[PDB]
Design a protein around this ligand. Structure first.
Ligand code: G6P
Ligand code: G6P
Lengths: 929, 929
């Protein structure tokens, strides 16, 4: 009768339970159904094996008895390659289930009705403010008129830049995840028949299996990796955006604005790095970039195309204004179809349809030109027949729209037509615009080739002042720099060709050219010059990304110098965007010192832009508090230094967060919602400025933290051998892209790998190291600092948000895993070094607690804690499995007695098991640094 | 918990929406087990579970092995442990019945009903009072005024008899508390804490019941003082609630006034201390005492609530009529305390009600002193000797209120109180007297012989009549103080001295058991005259044997022919009938049909002589079933047999179901009132002559079979004495030499109910059905049309069907095997064969595959009780063996119950175990014949 109630009972033990809190039930059902499936497919024997692992991991998660971990080891390590693959798949798959259940729980959790009004409320989905509440706060708590709010909003832009998953999932598998999540959602609805329940049951059972059996063993091209993206948009964002904008409309009613948000106001914009970012990544060629533009153009046209037919059916009206009636007549007159819904000709009896039919053909053509260009390279298709610019596509829709209003039918015009206008206006002809990123040294290499080939010396050898002097001269040069007959290395050709691609393609494909490892004025001019050389008609804006602390300290001088140049001031036309990267900067100096430095740098650069009349946009690269997703993003955005958003947000949406943020319609909606709300609020309601005591203490702690971080990571010569052993970092490095930009050392290692290696291991060093020294030293210098730190946590959003993130990571941390790793993988001489780090973990964690005023991690956030506690047993099993696998890979001569093979049925090795393991853990850990 | 498991194993017994019964039973059982553990130890708890598991397993499959395994267990228990098990199961039953009461109470009514009369056989589909009114008005062209009028003149008298085995006022209230705790545990918006506390409340109250189990006989006085509980508990409040519903129902058909508060719609009566038929414990002094108790307690009830009405009646505006009488009372210038003060005429309603209170108190005290001393120094002036005296001041208040513009207030508690007073009078119940005809003969014979004029016994009926009428107008007494009297004749004569001394509002009817003739009734009239009873009780013949029924019409005709009698009865005669009694003579079937005809004939006869005839339904009817079935049973009565006046026995074994829970109480009252009303305006169809004819034919055959087996077969009584606890019941009222004709009906029915075989209820139906079908296969169709179309027939078959559902021939078989000698077993086998064949014909006629297809809810109720009953049957059977048999002993298990804490009879505790058993079974079986 009842496997489930028991599985529920044994799942409750992990987190004690309440009202709309279904998570444990959800997880229980999913798990119980999943076990049956393992039984059918692989046999009782294996099912038990899987349960045993779970029981052990769970028992471990409760008490934390290192014995349990070893028992688990004995089990996992005794499995042949075949069975371990299966277990690895199993746990890796129960995780994805646990995440769906959590998405669903988060989606339907009840909002708190009366909120404290504290800014802390904005760090949690249940208490944060929706758009209407935000408007109201601004109007009533801040004396802004509705008109002023409406106005702010009309001018606001929010750009979400999508990056590729650092490990990324299949469009099929997504949809199974959706179907499973829906079956589950549906099983919990009252007024549900025994039959429907029975049928939903088998539907659920079936869709889990279908997912489990979609598990083929692999690398994939940038093109496919990107063609991935065009899914999530279909799946959720494409529909999400109109839904949200309609909510904006409703919210404006309720504060007394009697009009809808203009359909062409560019409130929300999307962008991408996929096929764009070539930094330390030679797989991203010019041809790749040409292909992702054409794909983007294609698919977008296709989307507009597959829904136009539905709008056409809906638009059965015959009453129109004359403006339209003319243009319809024209179009019927000029007539004399590959697809089928409307495969016929259409009576001018129904004019809206005539227009939209033309639109459809044009969309189809636009689809086809991009398709042929993509596969052939030529296409015999006139610009006349096709949308080369979004205005061309809006125009007929605006026509219909106006016509409807004029005939007295605005109410109808504000239905699907409006949604469609909003989609077109948000997504344009290219769903995402592509950013280009390359590292400064590359532009230097190119310019050096040029200068040397010209016989004038070596750009590399020149001083900054010289580079600037030369660059400006040539920026007004009266004759080209570059011949066809210039000697080029493959890299230089690759780089130059990227500009040939930028010149050939329509500019509505592209966003910014980001310069990785920027450090100077010359770095930006260099890119400007090459754009001029290739006669790019609408050059992309150049965006320096300042990474290292020193580079951040130098940035203000660099920006000031830029803004001092008339050539440059006039090219940028009042607008500059600068990029920052929390992970990057924190790899240099620790997370703490990087956080603080970035606060100040933004402040200074804002001040500098203000002085020169420049609107400054700060592009948030990965690693922020602001890329967490969920409520915490809400507060993180409000926590930003004053005037740093100023109506224009641009942030990275880290791949490892795209599912949480967008994969479910409600979360999708609220993601969009908070980005828009927070951005709006901030420009009219900055956080308080830090008290000077706080700046002073923060400066003092930064030095100590950076000292500790660098002591351990760069100064200590034992560290890299430790890292290489205690961590799958090397094995990761036989992949996404070369994680060492072969030079050797941590400074050489890229940040994603850095973060990822220590996340696998549950130890998370890159995120907390240096916080402990900083805290300890500040308290030991003066016990009154504890009070100050606490006041800072209570009152200073930046600080709060900074500590919450590190707290969340400790909650996903477990030093026992780190300890097991030492014991299995690390040599006897390095173990005390490990012990030492674990000691620092603990001490850091405890200070962090003392400062937030919590006994236990996440007291402020039981729901998040519950989510984590539930995932853990699964992750733990993967950690352990991983650890022994790493052993067997590294040590050809480690062997133990293998249990006779357990899986039934009715070529793969350790490396395959390790990948499964790396991906399960990564998906269980989501974002950290 | 282990509840879900107990729920799971309870579901198996009966495989939905508001169907909580299984949960209810599960919880109760799980709580009850814990209690057995605490009090008696794991060891015993398991023993109890084992019995339950076995019984349940048995109830599903019906494997005789299970029964034997159970036997081995039960028969291996020492006297100490078997007592405990017997208490346990006997107590789980009472729990199961409370749960069922609760389930029945809250089951949902069907909203659209077929309109068929079958709908009235089930609580979910039967008609409430409003629906009845509406049917009458719309489907039958009666004006609201005509309905209202019918109702105003309608009387419903419920005569309460004593439980044939009866429960304690304390224990009732525990049953109530348990039932409420349970009801409360199932309510949403309920806290973890309230749930926790209700849990322990529940747990506690079960234990308190379980530990209220002392071993004993009790006096008629106490047995009756029992009654005065159920009224307190439920009827006292029930009546006003229902009458208020009548009021609401009258609104909704457009009558704009309330049911008159003094219209005697509902009246109650009792046999307790009244019925002395074959029961010499019921002496004259007993009868005196139950009148005085009744008078006392009733005064007390009025008294304990008056104080609450007085507080409520804080008004000061009154009419003059009242204001005078108040002034008077204050002008004319306290043991208890609520109002222990004097009262300002400032508040006049209170002044009146204070007087009323004192008068009620005095009335209470006089009855109390008379009861314990025999004299009381208390003037009639100080006291209510007549209900009008108590109404008058209430009507005063009532009128005053309406006159001051406060009728709305007057229709609150005051109205309730008026209704109570008017329904219950000064004596909650009126007492009927019953004695058997032969006794009056014995008395008159003593008299005639002492007078020297011969022997009344020897005289012919014509002679008796001639003498009786002469003496009924005699001009001088019959009886001296000097008359020779046996203890019986004195007992009988003293009863009349008691009737003459006590107020007439204490009494109802004098029922003559074993009536047969006109003289039988005149005899009683004469003795009443002799004792100068100022308001003689009406004489009611109870005709029992079939012959006595066939002779009744001639007897009634003769009575109605006598001017002496016609003028004494003043237009009204009541006649009693007794289904069980008559069915003990001739079989249930022939008795049913004969009673249909007798009623018809006697009705006809009364109609001809201008006499309003009331038929007093004694026990055994379809009409004493309680629940919906009663509803249809009443509607099924022959035309004109109710004629505005229903009088029916409420069998003791049905009082709990009918009244113990406020909702069932209300609906019991409801259907009695509704059915009665409807019938006088909407009789059932009259039987088709073919049907009469076939019924007459089947009656002969059925009587033949019944009498063949019971009276003609000389082996029968030895069979009965062995297969049945009948003898042991007979060491209890005396159930002097025997034979079955001698044995009383309750014992007859009860003996075969214990045994789950139920012979008295079905025997003879099988022969009748078989012979009718074998004479002519077209009869089957006729029988089925009768079942479909003729309420009497339907109702008659449903009852027998219900009994088969409570039947189990395996128990009967086990009994034979354990208790009956080898030579009589084939006789048993033969009866079991008849059981089967009868059951199967009965099914074939109702058109059912299985028993109770028409009634899944009832079947569920039975299925759930059964395992408990089965355990008691088995326990019982072996106990009966050990009692009867010197040659039986088996190895006893070492004692199982723990404990911390002479009483000898026949065998050392067996007799006690048997009683427990007899009472558990009886309470699990409720009503059958
Ligand atoms: O961090 P990397 O290893 O350079 O990899 C790529 C990431 O780098 C930076 O930190 C950027 O700020 C992000 O927009 C990007 O996802
Ligand atoms: O023991 P008995 O002869 O049945 O007497 C007791 C019963 O007798 C008759 O059947 C009456 O109709 C009942 O009102 C009463 O309960």
């Amino acid at each position: 009768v009842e496997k489930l109630a028991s599985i529920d009972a044994q799942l409750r033990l992990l987190v004690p339970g309440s009202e709309d809190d279904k998570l444990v039930e959800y997880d229980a059902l999913l798990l119980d159904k999943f076990l049956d499936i393992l039984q059918d497919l692989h046999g009782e024997d294996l099912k038990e094996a899987v349960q045993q692992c779970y029981e052990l991991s769970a028992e471990y998660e409760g008490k934390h008895d290192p014995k349990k971990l070893e028992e688990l080891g004995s089990l996992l390590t005794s499995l042949d390659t075949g069975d371990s693959i299966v277990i690895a798949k199993a746990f890796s798959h129960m995780l994805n289930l646990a995440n769906l259940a959590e998405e669903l729980q988060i989606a339907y959790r009840r909002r708190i009705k009366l909120k404290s009004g504290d800014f802390a409320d904005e760090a949690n989905a249940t208490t944060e403010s929706d758009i209407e509440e935000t408007f109201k706060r601004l109007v009533h708590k801040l004396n802004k008129s509705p008109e002023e709010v409406f106005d702010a909003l009309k001018n606001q832009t929010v750009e979400l830049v999508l990056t590729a998953h650092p490990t990324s999932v299949r469009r099929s598998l997504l949809q199974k995840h959706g179907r499973i999540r829906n079956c589950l959602a549906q099983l919990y609805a009252k007024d549900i028949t025994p039959d429907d329940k029975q049928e939903l049951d088998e539907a659920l059972h079936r869709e889990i299996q279908a997912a489990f059996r979609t598990d083929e063993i692999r690398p994939p091209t940038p093109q496919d990796e990107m063609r991935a993206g065009m899914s999530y948009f279909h799946e959720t964002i494409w529909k999400g955006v109109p839904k949200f904008l309609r909510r904006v409309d409703t919210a404006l009613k309720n504060i007394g604005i009697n009009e809808r948000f203009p359909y062409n106001a560019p409130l929300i914009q999307f962008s991408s790095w996929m096929g764009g970012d070539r930094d330390g990544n030679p797989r991203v060629t010019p041809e790749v970039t040409r292909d992702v533009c054409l794909l983007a153009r294609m698919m977008t046209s296709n989307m507009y195309f597959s829904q136009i037919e539905d709008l056409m059916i809906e638009m059965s009206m015959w009453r129109c204004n004359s403006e339209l009636r003319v243009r319809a007549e024209e179009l019927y007159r000029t007539a004399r179809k590959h697809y089928i819904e409307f495969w016929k000709r259409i009576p001018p009896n129904q004019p809206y349809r005539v227009i939209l039919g033309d639109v459809r053909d044009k969309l189809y053509n636009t689809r086809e030109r991009s398709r042929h260009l993509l596969v052939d390279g030529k296409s015999d298709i006139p610009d006349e027949a096709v949308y080369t610019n979004v205005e061309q596509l809006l125009e007929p829709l605006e026509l219909c729209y106006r016509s409807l209003c004029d005939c007295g039918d605005h109410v109808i015009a504000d239905g699907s037509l409006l949604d469609f206008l909003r989609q077109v206006s948000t997504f344009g002809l290219s769903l995402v615009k592509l950013d280009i990123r390359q590292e400064s040294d590359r532009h230097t290499e190119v310019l050096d080739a040029i200068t040397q080939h010209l016989g004038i010396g070596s750009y590399r050898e020149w001083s900054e002042e010289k580079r600037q002097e030369w660059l400006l001269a040539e920026l007004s040069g009266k004759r080209p720099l570059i011949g066809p007959d210039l000697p080029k290395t493959e890299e230089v050709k690759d780089c130059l060709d990227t500009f040939k691609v930028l010149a050939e393609l329509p500019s509505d494909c592209f966003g910014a050219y980001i310069i990785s490892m920027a450090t100077s004025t010359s770095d930006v001019l260099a890119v400007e010059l090459l754009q001029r050389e290739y006669h790019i008609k609408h050059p992309l804006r150049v965006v320096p990304l300042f990474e290292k602390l020193a580079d951040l300290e130098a940035a203000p001088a660099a920006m000031t110098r830029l803004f001092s140049m008339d050539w440059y001031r006039n090219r940028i036309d009042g607008k500059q965007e600068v990029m920052i990267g929390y992970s990057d900067s924190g790899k240099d100096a620790g997370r703490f010192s990087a956080a603080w430095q970035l606060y100040k740098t933004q402040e200074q650069i804002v001040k500098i832009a203000k002085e020169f009349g420049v609107k400054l946009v700060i592009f948030h690269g990965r690693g922020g508090t602001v890329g967490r997703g969920g409520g915490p993003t809400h507060l993180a955005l409000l926590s930003q230094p004053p005037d740093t958003i100023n109506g224009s947000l641009r942030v990275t949406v880290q791949g490892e967060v795209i599912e949480q943020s967008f994969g479910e319609e409600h979360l999708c909606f609220r993601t969009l919602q908070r980005f828009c709300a927070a951005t709006l609020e901030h420009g009219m309601n900055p956080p308080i400025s830090p008290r000077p005591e706080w700046r002073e203490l923060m400066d003092q702690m930064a030095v100590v933290a950076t000292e500790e971080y660098r002591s351990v990571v760069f100064k200590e010569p034992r560290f890299v051998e430790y890292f290489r052993l205690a961590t799958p970092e090397l094995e990761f490095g036989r992949m996404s892209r070369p994680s060492k930009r072969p030079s050797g050392g941590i400074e050489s290692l890229r940040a994603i790998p850095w973060i990822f290696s220590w996340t696998q291991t549950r130890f998370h060093l890159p995120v907390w190291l240096g916080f402990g020294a900083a805290f300890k030293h500040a308290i030991q210098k003066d016990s009154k600092n504890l009070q100050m730190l606490q006041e800072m946590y209570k009152t200073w959003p930046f600080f709060r948000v900074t500590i919450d993130l590190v707290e969340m990571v400790f909650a996903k941390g477990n030093p026992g895993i780190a300890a097991l790793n030492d014991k299995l993988l690390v040599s006897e001489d390095l173990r005390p070094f490990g012990e030492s780090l674990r000691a620092n973990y603990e001490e850091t964690k405890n200070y962090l607690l003392k400062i937030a005023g919590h006994k236990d991690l996440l007291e402020g956030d039981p729901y998040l804690k519950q989510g984590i506690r539930l995932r853990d047993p699964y992750i733990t099993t993967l950690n352990v499995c991983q650890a022994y696998t790493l052993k067997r890979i590294r040590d050809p001569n480690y062997h133990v007695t293998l249990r006779p093979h357990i899986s039934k049925e009715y070529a793969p090795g350790l490396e395959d098991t390790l990948i499964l393991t790396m991906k399960g853990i990564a998906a269980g850990m989501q974002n950290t640094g």
